[PDB]
Short mmCIF file of C-alpha atoms in Angstrom, two decimals:
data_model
loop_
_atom_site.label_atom_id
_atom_site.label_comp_id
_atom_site.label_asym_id
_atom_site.label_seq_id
_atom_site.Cartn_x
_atom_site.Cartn_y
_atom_site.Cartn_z
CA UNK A 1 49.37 28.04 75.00
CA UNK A 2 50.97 27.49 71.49
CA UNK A 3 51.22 30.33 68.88
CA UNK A 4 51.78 29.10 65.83
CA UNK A 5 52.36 32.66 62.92
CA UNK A 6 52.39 31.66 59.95
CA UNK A 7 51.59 32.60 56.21
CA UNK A 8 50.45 30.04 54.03
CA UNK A 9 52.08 31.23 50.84
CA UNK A 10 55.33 30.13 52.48
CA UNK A 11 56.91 27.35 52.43
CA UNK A 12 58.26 26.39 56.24
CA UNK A 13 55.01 27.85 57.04
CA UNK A 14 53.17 25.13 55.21
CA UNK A 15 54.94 22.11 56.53
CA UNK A 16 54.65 23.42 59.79
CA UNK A 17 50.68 23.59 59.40
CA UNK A 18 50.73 20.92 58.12
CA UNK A 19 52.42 18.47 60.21
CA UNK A 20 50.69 20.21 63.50
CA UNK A 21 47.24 19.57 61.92
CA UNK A 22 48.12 16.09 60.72
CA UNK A 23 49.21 15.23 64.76
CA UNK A 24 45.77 17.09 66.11
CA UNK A 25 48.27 19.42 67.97
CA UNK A 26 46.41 22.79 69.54
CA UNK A 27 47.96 25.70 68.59
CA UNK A 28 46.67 29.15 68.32
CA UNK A 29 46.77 30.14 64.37
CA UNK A 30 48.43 33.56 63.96
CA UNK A 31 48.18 34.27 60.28
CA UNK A 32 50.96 36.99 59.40
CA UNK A 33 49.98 38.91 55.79
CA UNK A 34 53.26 38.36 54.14
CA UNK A 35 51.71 40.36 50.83
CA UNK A 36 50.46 43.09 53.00
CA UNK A 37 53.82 43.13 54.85
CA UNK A 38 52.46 42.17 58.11
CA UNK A 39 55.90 40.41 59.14
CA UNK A 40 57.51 43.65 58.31
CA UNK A 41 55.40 45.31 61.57
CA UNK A 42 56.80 46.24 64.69
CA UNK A 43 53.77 44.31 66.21
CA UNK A 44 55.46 41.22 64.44
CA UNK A 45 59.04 42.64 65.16
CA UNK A 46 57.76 42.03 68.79
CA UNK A 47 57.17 38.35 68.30
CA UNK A 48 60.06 37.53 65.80
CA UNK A 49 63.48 40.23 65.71
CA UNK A 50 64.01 38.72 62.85
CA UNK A 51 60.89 39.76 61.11
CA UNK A 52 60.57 36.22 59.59
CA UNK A 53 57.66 33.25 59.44
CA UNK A 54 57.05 30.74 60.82
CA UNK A 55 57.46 31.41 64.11
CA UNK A 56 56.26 29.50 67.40
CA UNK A 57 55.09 31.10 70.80
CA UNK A 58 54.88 28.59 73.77
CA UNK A 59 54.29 30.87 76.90
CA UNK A 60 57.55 32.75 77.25
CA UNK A 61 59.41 30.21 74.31
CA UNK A 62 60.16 31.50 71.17
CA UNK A 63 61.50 29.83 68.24
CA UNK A 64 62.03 29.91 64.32
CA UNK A 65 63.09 28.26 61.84
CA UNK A 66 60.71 25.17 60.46
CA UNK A 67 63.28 22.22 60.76
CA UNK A 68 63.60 23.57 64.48
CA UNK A 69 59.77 23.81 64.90
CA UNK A 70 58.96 20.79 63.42
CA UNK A 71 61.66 19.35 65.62
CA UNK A 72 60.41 21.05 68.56
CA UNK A 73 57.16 19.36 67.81
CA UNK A 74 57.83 16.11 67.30
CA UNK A 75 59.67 15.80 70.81
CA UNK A 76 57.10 17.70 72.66
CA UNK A 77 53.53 16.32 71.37
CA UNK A 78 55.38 12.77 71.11
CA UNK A 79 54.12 12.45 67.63
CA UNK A 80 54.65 9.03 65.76
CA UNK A 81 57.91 7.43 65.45
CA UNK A 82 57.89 7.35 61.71
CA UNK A 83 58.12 11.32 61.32
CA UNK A 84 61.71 11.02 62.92
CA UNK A 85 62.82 7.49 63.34
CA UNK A 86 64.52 6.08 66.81
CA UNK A 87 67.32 3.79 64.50
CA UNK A 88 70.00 6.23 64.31
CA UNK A 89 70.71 5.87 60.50
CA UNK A 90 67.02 6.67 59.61
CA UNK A 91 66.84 9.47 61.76
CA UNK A 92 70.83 10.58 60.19
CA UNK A 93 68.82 10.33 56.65
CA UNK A 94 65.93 12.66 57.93
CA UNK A 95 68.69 15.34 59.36
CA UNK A 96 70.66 15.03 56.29
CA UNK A 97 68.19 15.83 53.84
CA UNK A 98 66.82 18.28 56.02
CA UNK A 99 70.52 20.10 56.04
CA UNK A 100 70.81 19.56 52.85
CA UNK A 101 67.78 21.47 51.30
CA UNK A 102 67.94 25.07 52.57
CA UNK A 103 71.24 25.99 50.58
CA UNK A 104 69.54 23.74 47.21
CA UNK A 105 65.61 22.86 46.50
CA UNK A 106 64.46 25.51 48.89
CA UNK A 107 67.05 28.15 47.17
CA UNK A 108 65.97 26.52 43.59
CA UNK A 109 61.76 26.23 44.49
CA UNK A 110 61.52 29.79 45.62
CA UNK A 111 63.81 31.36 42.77
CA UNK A 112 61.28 29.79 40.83
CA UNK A 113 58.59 31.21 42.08
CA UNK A 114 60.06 34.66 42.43
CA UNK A 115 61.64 34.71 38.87
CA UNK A 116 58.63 33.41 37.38
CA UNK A 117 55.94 34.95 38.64
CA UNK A 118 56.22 37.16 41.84
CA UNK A 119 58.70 39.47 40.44
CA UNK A 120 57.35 40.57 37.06
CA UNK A 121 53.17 40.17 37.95
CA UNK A 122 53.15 40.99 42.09
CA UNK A 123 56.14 43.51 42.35
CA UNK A 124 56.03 45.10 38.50
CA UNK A 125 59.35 44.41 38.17
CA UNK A 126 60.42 42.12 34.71
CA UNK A 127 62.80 39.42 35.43
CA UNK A 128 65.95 38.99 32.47
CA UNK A 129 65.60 36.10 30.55
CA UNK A 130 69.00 34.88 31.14
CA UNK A 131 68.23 35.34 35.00
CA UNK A 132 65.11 32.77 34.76
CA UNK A 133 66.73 30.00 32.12
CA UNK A 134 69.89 29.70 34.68
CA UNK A 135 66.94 29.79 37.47
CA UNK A 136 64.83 26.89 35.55
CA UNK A 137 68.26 25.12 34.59
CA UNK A 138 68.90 25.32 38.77
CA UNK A 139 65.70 23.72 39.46
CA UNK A 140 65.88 20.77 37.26
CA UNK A 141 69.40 20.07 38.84
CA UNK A 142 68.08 20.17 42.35
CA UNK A 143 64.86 17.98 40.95
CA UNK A 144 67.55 15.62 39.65
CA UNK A 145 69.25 15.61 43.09
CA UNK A 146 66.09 14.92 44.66
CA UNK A 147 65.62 12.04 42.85
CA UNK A 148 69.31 10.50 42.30
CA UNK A 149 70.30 10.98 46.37
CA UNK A 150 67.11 10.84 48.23
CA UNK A 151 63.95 9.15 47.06
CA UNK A 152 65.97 7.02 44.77
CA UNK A 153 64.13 3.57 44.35
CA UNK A 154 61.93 4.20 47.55
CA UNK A 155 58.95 4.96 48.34
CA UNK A 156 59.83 7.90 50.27
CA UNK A 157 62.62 9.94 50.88
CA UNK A 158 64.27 8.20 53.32
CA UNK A 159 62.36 4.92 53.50
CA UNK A 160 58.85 3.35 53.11
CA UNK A 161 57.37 5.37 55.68
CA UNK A 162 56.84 9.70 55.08
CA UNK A 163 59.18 11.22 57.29
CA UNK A 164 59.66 14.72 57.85
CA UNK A 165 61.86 15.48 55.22
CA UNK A 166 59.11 14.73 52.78
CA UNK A 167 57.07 16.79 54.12
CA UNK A 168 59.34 19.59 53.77
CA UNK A 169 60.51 18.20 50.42
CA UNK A 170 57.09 18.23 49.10
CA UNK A 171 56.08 22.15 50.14
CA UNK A 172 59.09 22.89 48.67
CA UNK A 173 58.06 22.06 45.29
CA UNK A 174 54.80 23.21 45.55
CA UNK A 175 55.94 26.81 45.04
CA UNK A 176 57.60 25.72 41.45
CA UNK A 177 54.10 24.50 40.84
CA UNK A 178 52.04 27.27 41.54
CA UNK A 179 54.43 29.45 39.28
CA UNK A 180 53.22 26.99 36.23
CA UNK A 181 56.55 25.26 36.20
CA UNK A 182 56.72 21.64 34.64
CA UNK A 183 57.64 20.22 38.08
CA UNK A 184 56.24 16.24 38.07
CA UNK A 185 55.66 16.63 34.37
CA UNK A 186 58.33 13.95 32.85
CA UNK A 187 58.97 12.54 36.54
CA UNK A 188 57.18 9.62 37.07
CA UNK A 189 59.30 8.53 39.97
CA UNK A 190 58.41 12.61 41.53
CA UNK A 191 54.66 12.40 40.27
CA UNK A 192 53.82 9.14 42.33
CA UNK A 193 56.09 9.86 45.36
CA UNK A 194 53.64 12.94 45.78
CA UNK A 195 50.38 11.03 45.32
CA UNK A 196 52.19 8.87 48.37
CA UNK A 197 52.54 11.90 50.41
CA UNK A 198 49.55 13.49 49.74
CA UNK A 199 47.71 10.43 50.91
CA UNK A 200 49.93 10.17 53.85
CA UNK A 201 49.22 13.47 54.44
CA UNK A 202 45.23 13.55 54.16
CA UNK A 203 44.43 15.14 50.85
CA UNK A 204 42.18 17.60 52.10
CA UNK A 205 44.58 18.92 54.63
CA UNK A 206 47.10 19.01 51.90
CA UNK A 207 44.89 20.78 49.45
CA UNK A 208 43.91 23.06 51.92
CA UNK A 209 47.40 24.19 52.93
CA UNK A 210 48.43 24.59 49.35
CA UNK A 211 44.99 27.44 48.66
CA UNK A 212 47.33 30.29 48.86
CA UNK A 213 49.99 29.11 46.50
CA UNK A 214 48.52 27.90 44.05
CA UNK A 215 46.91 31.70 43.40
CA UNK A 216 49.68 33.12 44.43
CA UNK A 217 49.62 34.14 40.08
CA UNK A 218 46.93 36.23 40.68
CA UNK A 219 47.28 38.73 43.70
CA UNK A 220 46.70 42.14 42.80
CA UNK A 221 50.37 44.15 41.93
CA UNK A 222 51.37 45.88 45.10
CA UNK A 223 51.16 49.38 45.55
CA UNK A 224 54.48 51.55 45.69
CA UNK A 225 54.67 51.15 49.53
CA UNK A 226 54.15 47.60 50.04
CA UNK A 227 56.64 47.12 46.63
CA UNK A 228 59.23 49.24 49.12
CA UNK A 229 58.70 47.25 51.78
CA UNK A 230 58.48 43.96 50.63
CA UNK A 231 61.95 44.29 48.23
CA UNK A 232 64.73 44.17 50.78
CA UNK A 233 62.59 40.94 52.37
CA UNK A 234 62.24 38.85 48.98
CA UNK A 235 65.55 40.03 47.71
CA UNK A 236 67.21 38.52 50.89
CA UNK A 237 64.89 35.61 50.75
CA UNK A 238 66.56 34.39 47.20
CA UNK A 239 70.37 35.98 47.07
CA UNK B 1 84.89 1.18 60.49
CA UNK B 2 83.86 4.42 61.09
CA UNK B 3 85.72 6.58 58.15
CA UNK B 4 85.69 10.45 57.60
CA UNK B 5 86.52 12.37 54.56
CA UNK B 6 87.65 16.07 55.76
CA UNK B 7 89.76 18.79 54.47
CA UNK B 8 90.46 21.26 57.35
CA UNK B 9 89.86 24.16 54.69
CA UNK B 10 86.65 23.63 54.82
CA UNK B 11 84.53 25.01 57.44
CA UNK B 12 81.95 22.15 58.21
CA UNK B 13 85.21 19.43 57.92
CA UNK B 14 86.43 21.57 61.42
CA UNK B 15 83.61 21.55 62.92
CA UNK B 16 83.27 17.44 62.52
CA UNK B 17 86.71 17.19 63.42
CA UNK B 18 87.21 18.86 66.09
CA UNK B 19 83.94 17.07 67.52
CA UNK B 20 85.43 13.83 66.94
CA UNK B 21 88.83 14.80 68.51
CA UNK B 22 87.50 16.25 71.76
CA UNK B 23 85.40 12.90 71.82
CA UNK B 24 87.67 10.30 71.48
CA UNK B 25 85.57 9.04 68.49
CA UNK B 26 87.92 6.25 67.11
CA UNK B 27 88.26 6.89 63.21
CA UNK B 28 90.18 6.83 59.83
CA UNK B 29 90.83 10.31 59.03
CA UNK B 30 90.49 10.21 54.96
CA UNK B 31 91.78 13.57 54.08
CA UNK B 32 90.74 15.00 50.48
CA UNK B 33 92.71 17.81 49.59
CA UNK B 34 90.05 20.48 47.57
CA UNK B 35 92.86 22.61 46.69
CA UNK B 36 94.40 19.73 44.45
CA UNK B 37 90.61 19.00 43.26
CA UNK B 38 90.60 15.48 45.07
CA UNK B 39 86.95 16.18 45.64
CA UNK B 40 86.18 16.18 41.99
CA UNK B 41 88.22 12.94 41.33
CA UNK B 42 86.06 9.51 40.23
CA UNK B 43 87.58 8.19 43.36
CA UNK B 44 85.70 10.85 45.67
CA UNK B 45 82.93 10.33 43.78
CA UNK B 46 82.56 6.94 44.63
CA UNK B 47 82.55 7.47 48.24
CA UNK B 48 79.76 10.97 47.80
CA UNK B 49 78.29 11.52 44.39
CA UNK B 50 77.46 14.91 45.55
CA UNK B 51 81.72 15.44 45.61
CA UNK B 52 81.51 17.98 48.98
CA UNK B 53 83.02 17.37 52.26
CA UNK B 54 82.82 16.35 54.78
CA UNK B 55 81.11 12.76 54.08
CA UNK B 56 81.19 9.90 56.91
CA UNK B 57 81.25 6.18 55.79
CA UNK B 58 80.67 3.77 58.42
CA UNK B 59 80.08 0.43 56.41
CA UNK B 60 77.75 -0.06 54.02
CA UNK B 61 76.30 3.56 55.85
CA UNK B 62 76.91 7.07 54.18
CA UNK B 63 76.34 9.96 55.16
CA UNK B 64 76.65 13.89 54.34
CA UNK B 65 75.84 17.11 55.78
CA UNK B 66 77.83 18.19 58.66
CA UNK B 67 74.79 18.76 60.45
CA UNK B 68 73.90 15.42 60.35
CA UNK B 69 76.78 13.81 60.99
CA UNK B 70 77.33 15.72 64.00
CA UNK B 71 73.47 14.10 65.28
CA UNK B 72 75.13 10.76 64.35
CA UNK B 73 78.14 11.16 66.63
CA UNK B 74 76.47 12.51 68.97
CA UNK B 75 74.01 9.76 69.98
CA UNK B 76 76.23 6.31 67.93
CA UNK B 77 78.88 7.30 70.26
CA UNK B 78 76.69 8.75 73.51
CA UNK B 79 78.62 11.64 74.06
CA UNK B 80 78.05 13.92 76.60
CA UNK B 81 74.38 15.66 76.76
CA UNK B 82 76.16 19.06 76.90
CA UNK B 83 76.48 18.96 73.10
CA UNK B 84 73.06 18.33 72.07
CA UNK B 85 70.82 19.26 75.16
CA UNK B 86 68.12 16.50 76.52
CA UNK B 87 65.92 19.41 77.81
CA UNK B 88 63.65 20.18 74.81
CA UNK B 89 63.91 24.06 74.55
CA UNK B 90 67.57 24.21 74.66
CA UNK B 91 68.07 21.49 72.02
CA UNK B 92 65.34 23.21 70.37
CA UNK B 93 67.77 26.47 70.83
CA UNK B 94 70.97 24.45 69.09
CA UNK B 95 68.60 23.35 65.97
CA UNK B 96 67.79 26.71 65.49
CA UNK B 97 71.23 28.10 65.13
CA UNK B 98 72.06 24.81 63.20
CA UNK B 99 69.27 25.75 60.62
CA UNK B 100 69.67 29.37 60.55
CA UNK B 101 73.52 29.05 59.45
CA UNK B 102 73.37 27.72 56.61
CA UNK B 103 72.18 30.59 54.58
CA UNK B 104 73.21 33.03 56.85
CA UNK B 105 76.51 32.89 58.81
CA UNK B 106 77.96 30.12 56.50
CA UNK B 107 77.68 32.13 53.67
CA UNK B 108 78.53 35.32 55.04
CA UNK B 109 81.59 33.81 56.23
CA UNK B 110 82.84 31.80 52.67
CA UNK B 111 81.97 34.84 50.61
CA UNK B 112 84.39 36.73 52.51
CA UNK B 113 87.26 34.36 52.40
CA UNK B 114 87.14 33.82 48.78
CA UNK B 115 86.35 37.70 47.76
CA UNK B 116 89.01 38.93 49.91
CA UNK B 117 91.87 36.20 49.30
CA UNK B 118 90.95 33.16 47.69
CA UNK B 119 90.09 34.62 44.56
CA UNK B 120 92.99 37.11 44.22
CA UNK B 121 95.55 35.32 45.72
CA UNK B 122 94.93 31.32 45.08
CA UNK B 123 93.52 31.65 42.03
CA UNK B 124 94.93 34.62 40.01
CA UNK B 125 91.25 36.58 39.82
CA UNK B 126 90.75 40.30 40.65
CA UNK B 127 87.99 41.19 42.74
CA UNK B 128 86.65 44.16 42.31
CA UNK B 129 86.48 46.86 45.47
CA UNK B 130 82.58 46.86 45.05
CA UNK B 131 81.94 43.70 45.57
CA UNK B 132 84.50 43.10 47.99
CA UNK B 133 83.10 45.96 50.38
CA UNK B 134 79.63 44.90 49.56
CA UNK B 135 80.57 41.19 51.12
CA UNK B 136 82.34 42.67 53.82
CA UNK B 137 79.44 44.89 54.68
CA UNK B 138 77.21 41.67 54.53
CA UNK B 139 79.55 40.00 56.92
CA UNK B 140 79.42 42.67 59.55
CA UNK B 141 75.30 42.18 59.38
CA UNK B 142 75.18 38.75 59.76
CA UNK B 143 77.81 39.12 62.87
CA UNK B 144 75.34 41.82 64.58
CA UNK B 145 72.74 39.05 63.54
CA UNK B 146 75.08 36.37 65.88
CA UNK B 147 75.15 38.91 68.75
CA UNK B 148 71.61 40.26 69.00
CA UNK B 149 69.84 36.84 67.86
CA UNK B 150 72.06 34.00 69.91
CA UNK B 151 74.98 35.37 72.16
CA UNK B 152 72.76 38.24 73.85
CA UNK B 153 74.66 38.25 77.07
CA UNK B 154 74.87 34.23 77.39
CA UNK B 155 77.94 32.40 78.09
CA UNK B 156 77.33 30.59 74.93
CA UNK B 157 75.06 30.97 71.75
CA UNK B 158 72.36 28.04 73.32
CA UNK B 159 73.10 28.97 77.06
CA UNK B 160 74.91 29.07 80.05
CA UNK B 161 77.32 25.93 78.69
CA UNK B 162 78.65 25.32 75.00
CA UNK B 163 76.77 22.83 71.90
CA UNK B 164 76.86 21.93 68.80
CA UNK B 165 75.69 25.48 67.94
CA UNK B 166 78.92 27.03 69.25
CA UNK B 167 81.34 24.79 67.59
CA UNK B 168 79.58 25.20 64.22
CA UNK B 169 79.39 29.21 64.75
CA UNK B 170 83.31 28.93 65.63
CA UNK B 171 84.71 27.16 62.95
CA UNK B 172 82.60 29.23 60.65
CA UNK B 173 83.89 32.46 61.90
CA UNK B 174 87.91 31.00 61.83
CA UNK B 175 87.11 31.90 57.43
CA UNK B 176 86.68 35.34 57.87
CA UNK B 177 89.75 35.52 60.25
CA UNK B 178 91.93 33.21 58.10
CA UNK B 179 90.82 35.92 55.47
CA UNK B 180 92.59 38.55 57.79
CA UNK B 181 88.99 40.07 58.72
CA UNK B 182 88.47 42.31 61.93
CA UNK B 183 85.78 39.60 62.97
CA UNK B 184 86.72 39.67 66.66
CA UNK B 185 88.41 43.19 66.87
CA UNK B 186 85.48 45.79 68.17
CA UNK B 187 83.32 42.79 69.11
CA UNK B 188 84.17 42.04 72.83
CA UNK B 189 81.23 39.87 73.86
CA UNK B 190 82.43 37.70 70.66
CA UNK B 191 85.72 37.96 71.40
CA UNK B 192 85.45 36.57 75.44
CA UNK B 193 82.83 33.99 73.56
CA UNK B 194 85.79 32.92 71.47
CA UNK B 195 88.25 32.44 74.39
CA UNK B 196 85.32 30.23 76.18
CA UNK B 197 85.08 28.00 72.91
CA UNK B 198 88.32 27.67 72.50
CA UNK B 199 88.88 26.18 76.55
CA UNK B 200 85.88 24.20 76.21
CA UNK B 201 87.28 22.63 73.22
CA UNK B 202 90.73 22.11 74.56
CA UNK B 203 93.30 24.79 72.52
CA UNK B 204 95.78 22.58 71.09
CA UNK B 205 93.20 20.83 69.55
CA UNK B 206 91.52 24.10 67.97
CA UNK B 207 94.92 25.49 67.10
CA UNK B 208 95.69 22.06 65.12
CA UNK B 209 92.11 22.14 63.24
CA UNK B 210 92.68 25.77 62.03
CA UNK B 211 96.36 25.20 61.17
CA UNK B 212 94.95 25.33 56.86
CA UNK B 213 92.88 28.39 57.24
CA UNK B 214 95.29 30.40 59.29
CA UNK B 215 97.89 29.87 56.23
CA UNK B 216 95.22 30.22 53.34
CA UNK B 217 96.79 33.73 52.59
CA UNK B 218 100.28 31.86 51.69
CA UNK B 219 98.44 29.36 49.28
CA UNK B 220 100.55 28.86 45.91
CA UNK B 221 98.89 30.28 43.03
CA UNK B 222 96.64 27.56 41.31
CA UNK B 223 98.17 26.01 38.44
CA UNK B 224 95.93 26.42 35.09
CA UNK B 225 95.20 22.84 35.49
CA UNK B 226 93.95 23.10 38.55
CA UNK B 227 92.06 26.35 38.12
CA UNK B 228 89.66 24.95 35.38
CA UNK B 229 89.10 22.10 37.62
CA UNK B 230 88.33 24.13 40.59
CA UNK B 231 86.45 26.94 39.06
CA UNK B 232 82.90 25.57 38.61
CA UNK B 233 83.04 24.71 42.25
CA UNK B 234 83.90 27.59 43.86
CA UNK B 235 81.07 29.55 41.83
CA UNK B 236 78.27 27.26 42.54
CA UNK B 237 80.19 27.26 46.21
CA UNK B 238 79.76 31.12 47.06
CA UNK B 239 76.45 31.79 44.87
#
């Protein structure tokens, strides 16, 4: 039936479990070792060209990227209205925030991460200073963005229901979080927009999709091959 | 009534237009020059704080992201189905490409514009060999990427008829050639692609929404003014 691969140390892959186990949707979990290299594979090059996660199998259907999955979703399991809105301009806010975050947060939350922690702990390999204050400086803009544009006085992103974008919006900055970054510290507007989505969410489903990042600090240092391997793929990942 | 804010140098403003055009879409055409820095004016921001193009303003409705305002055409005005597929795979299909792009294709695509002519020519700054081979080299990637990923042998990057997908792809690719790239020289399946787009689309109409790119290479010199205004933005732009 559906294949669902995914890794839940990233972030597409987490809103896509998520949002599948929040609408009881079957799917077949595939979990593809990111820190092992397991997307890397020709097993997984078989499945995804690309050599990417998340990915979706349905029969002979394949498809990635998580704003087209979770779209793909939504229209096929005829999930509730209130992920993706019928009134035209709620459903234009939902696409627009979900255009507007791969190029900003996503770019900002995983630089984060990376810059942080992943580079100088997993991969042995120190991070300038200069490189992570213009990398923390990034993320507070795109927090401020987040906040000014989208959730503004709401109490969601793009009205007083969770939508999708939230959901995206919200593993997004997750990854800041498990690299010890002051995310919701000082944003009281952020901080109680999340205990709204968690809740929306199911907080044990959202606890139990975050596991992996929130550890992510304390995976072993790869060995030299896996540190090969895993370079060109993170290096790509942040630009 | 419906209002859109464009500059045909810019690659998402094309694709919009050009949708509109070929639609009949009644609208105001609002143009804001980026060369003259009209998108960092107070006036601009008024209309989108976020001072990119294009923006849409339809009443007390804004909107951003060309991605999204494409969706909103699209169904406010009922267009044809063509564009933005009823059967789930193959919209599926035009949301991927739509999501992959941004970081991909779109960036491949501005990088080489402003490494090979914008910077040298419009605004007075060497580029050094290095990097310019180095984006150059990235652009060829991301245009095997195009091939092997969405054209395959296809009519169209979706399927057998043209989308949203296609358009987008175009008017990204039109950078690189304005640039005086080799982007559909040694590239026939691209190149026949091209000549499909281009009838689908109606030719006058593309030749009219590429008329600023084709003629970036004659741009004036910025004036210092200008280039202090401008310069912040076309860092953060390429990055």
């Amino acid at each position: 039936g559906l294949e669902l691969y995914l890794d839940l140390l990233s972030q597409p892959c987490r809103a896509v479990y998520i949002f599948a186990k929040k609408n009881d949707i079957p799917f077949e979990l595939r979990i593809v070792d990111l820190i092992k290299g397991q997307h890397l594979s020709d097993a997984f090059a078989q499945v995804n060209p690309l050599k990417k996660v998340p990915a979706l199998k349905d029969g002979d259907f394949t498809l990635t990227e998580s704003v087209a999955i979770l779209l793909y979703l939504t229209r096929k399991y005829k999930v509730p209205d209130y992920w993706y809105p019928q009134d035209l301009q709620a459903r234009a806010r939902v696409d627009e925030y979900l255009a507007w975050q791969h190029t900003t947060l996503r770019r900002s939350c995983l630089r984060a991460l990376w810059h942080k922690v992943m580079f100088p702990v997993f991969l042995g390999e120190p991070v300038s200073p200069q490189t992570l204050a213009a990398t923390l400086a990034e993320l507070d803009v795109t927090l401020q963005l987040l906040e000014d544009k989208f959730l503004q006085n709401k109490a969601f992103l793009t009205g007083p229901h969770i939508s999708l974008a939230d959901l995206v919006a919200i593993t997004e900055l997750m990854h800041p979080v498990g690299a010890g970054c002051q995310v919701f510290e000082g944003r009281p507007k952020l901080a109680t927009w999340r205990q709204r989505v968690e809740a929306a969410v199911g907080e044990d489903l959202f606890q139990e999709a975050h596991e992996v990042i929130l550890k992510a600090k304390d995976f072993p240092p790869a060995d030299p091959t896996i540190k090969q391997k895993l370079m060109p793929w993170v290096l790509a990942m942040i630009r």
